Design an enzyme around this catalytic site. Structure first.
Site, PDB file in Angstrom:
ATOM      1  N   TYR A 118      52.906 114.198   6.079  1.00 46.32           N
ATOM      2  CA  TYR A 118      53.406 113.291   5.620  1.00 46.32           C
ATOM      3  C   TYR A 118      53.332 111.757   6.373  1.00 46.32           C
ATOM      4  O   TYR A 118      52.877 111.858   7.546  1.00 46.32           O
ATOM      5  CB  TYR A 118      54.803 113.454   5.628  1.00 46.32           C
ATOM      6  N   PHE A 159      58.255 103.948  12.108  1.00 45.78           N
ATOM      7  CA  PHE A 159      57.316 104.520  11.140  1.00 45.78           C
ATOM      8  C   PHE A 159      56.868 105.981  11.967  1.00 45.78           C
ATOM      9  O   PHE A 159      57.058 106.059  13.177  1.00 45.78           O
ATOM     10  CB  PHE A 159      55.735 103.956  10.984  1.00 45.78           C
ATOM     11  N   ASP A 160      56.477 106.948  11.243  1.00 42.74           N
ATOM     12  CA  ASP A 160      56.160 108.267  11.721  1.00 42.74           C
ATOM     13  C   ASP A 160      55.347 109.062  10.714  1.00 42.74           C
ATOM     14  O   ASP A 160      55.559 108.772   9.372  1.00 42.74           O
ATOM     15  CB  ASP A 160      57.489 108.842  11.838  1.00 42.74           C
ATOM     16  N   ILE A 171      65.919 117.386   5.964  1.00 45.54           N
ATOM     17  CA  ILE A 171      66.873 116.610   5.255  1.00 45.54           C
ATOM     18  C   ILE A 171      66.874 117.173   3.773  1.00 45.54           C
ATOM     19  O   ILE A 171      65.698 117.639   3.121  1.00 45.54           O
ATOM     20  CB  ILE A 171      66.770 115.108   5.261  1.00 45.54           C
ATOM     21  N   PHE A 183      59.085 108.283   1.989  1.00 42.55           N
ATOM     22  CA  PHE A 183      57.916 109.098   2.408  1.00 42.55           C
ATOM     23  C   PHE A 183      56.987 109.214   1.397  1.00 42.55           C
ATOM     24  O   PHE A 183      57.095 109.040   0.106  1.00 42.55           O
ATOM     25  CB  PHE A 183      58.435 110.749   2.632  1.00 42.55           C
ATOM     26  N   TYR A 188      70.420 110.933   6.367  1.00 44.93           N
ATOM     27  CA  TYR A 188      71.001 111.012   7.580  1.00 44.93           C
ATOM     28  C   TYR A 188      72.419 110.507   7.385  1.00 44.93           C
ATOM     29  O   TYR A 188      73.380 110.377   8.450  1.00 44.93           O
ATOM     30  CB  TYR A 188      70.339 110.347   8.442  1.00 44.93           C
TER      31      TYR A 188
HETATM   32  C1  LIG Z   1      58.640 113.906  14.692  1.00 42.43           C
HETATM   33  O1  LIG Z   1      60.314 113.325  14.772  1.00 42.43           O
HETATM   34  C2  LIG Z   1      61.352 113.211  13.940  1.00 42.43           C
HETATM   35  C3  LIG Z   1      60.786 112.599  12.635  1.00 42.43           C
HETATM   36  C4  LIG Z   1      61.730 112.294  11.822  1.00 42.43           C
HETATM   37  C5  LIG Z   1      63.168 112.607  11.898  1.00 42.43           C
HETATM   38  C6  LIG Z   1      63.440 113.133  13.136  1.00 42.43           C
HETATM   39  O2  LIG Z   1      64.734 113.411  13.793  1.00 42.43           O
HETATM   40  C7  LIG Z   1      65.841 112.755  13.237  1.00 42.43           C
HETATM   41  C8  LIG Z   1      62.696 113.416  14.229  1.00 42.43           C
HETATM   42  O3  LIG Z   1      62.759 114.127  15.343  1.00 42.43           O
HETATM   43  C9  LIG Z   1      62.967 115.339  15.654  1.00 42.43           C
HETATM   44  C10 LIG Z   1      61.989 115.939  14.428  1.00 42.43           C
HETATM   45  C11 LIG Z   1      62.892 116.683  13.558  1.00 42.43           C
HETATM   46  C12 LIG Z   1      62.228 117.238  12.312  1.00 42.43           C
HETATM   47  C13 LIG Z   1      63.393 117.660  11.181  1.00 42.43           C
HETATM   48  C14 LIG Z   1      64.367 116.245  10.869  1.00 42.43           C
HETATM   49  O4  LIG Z   1      63.583 115.172  10.170  1.00 42.43           O
HETATM   50  C15 LIG Z   1      63.460 115.403   8.757  1.00 42.43           C
HETATM   51  O5  LIG Z   1      64.104 116.324   8.136  1.00 42.43           O
HETATM   52  C16 LIG Z   1      62.465 114.277   8.058  1.00 42.43           C
HETATM   53  C17 LIG Z   1      61.644 115.376   6.943  1.00 42.43           C
HETATM   54  C18 LIG Z   1      60.354 115.738   7.883  1.00 42.43           C
HETATM   55  C19 LIG Z   1      59.540 114.702   8.364  1.00 42.43           C
HETATM   56  C20 LIG Z   1      60.527 114.223   9.650  1.00 42.43           C
HETATM   57  N1  LIG Z   1      61.643 113.505   9.171  1.00 42.43           N
HETATM   58  C21 LIG Z   1      61.946 112.457   9.315  1.00 42.43           C
HETATM   59  O6  LIG Z   1      63.082 111.975   9.122  1.00 42.43           O
HETATM   60  C22 LIG Z   1      61.546 111.763  10.664  1.00 42.43           C
HETATM   61  C23 LIG Z   1      61.636 110.243  10.172  1.00 42.43           C
HETATM   62  C24 LIG Z   1      61.074 109.315  11.626  1.00 42.43           C
HETATM   63  C25 LIG Z   1      61.835 107.874  11.800  1.00 42.43           C
HETATM   64  C26 LIG Z   1      61.199 107.337  10.261  1.00 42.43           C
HETATM   65  C27 LIG Z   1      61.676 108.081   9.084  1.00 42.43           C
HETATM   66  C28 LIG Z   1      61.187 109.543   8.967  1.00 42.43           C
END
Ligand SMILES: COc1cc2cc(OC)c1OCCCCCCOC(=O)[C@@H]1CCCCN1C(=O)[C@H]2C1CCCCC1
Length: 128
Positions: free
Chosen positions: A45, A55-56, A75, A118, A101
């Site tokens: 992604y 960005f990520d 999410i 995304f 969120y």
């Molecule tokens: C790689 O780091 C992150 C990337 C996203 C969210 C995060 O946590 C709130 C992150 O921190 C810890 C990793 C947690 C992964 C589970 C939560 O995130 C998510 O559910 C979604 C969908 C899967 C890809 C990651 N993600 C995110 O929301 C990223 C965001 C990163 C900031 C830009 C918007 C995308």
């Protein structure tokens, strides 16, 4: 930009039909089967906030993002969105805060009431 195109042409894939999750297929997958709840799912992604300030990408970590579909490990928009994808598909999703969120955000990484974008590629999915 791509999110504009999603706001303009994208399919509303929510149940309540509230436009909280909009989808465009950018590259068509193959097969007819779309992952079932509980399946182990492999994606690449690229993500960003609508505010343009974060960005990520999975590529940055240099590996697939892996998760069990429908088990709350991502999410809600991902659980809904990825369940509509085929092996090989690339999709764009535009997501309002109620499917991401929320009003609490995930501070300071995701601010309160943020909209997310995304690009997702579904690589593979396996039965648990
Ligand atoms: C790689 O780091 C992150 C990337 C996203 C969210 C995060 O946590 C709130 C992150 O921190 C810890 C990793 C947690 C992964 C589970 C939560 O995130 C998510 O559910 C979604 C969908 C899967 C890809 C990651 N993600 C995110 O929301 C990223 C965001 C990163 C900031 C830009 C918007 C995308």
């Amino acid at each position: 930009g791509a999110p504009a195109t999603v706001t303009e042409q994208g399919e509303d894939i929510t149940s309540k039909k509230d436009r909280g999750v909009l989808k465009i297929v950018k590259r068509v997958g193959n097969g007819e089967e779309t992952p079932m709840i509980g399946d182990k799912v492999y994606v690449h992604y690229k993500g960003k906030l609508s505010n343009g300030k974060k960005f990520d990408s999975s590529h940055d970590r240099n590996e697939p993002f892996v998760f069990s579909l429908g088990k709350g490990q991502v999410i809600k928009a991902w659980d809904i969105g990825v369940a509509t994808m085929k092996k090989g598909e690339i999709a764009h999703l535009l997501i309002k805060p109620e499917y991401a969120y929320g009003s609490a955000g995930s501070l300071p990484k995701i601010p309160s009431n943020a909209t997310l974008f995304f690009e997702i590629e579904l690589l593979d999915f396996k039965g648990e």
